[PDB]
Structure 1
Amino acid sequence: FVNQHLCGSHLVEALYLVCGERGFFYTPKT
């Protein structure tokens, strides 16, 4: 059941940290 709400929260921390001083966008949709 649950897994997408927690899976999309573990990539945000490893997302802005990768770019560094830059930012990024996050939009889950097809």
Structure 2
Amino acid sequence: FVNQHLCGSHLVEALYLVCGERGFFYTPKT
């Protein structure tokens, strides 16, 4: 795999694809 530059909703899409049925938590600063 290659490194990623992900902003906004694109990060959330990547998390969705990486985690699948396990799901994930999305926790920005502030």
TM-score scaled by structure 2? Answer: 0.53
- Note the C-alpha offset of 1:8: 2.1
Report how many residues are paired. 30
* Per-residue deviation, residues 1-30 of structure 1 (Å, max 9, x unmatched): 999998121110011111111111011116
Higher relative contact order at CA 8 Å, sep ≥6: structure 1 or structure 2? 2
TM-score scaled by structure 1? Answer: 0.53
For the aligned residues, what is the CA RMSD? Answer: 6.6
Structure 1's consecutive aligned runs of 4 or more residues displaced over 4 angstroms after TM superposition are 1-6
Larger Rg computed on CA atoms: 1
- Identical-residue share of aligned pairs (%): 100
Structure 2 residues without counterparts, runs of 5 or longer: none
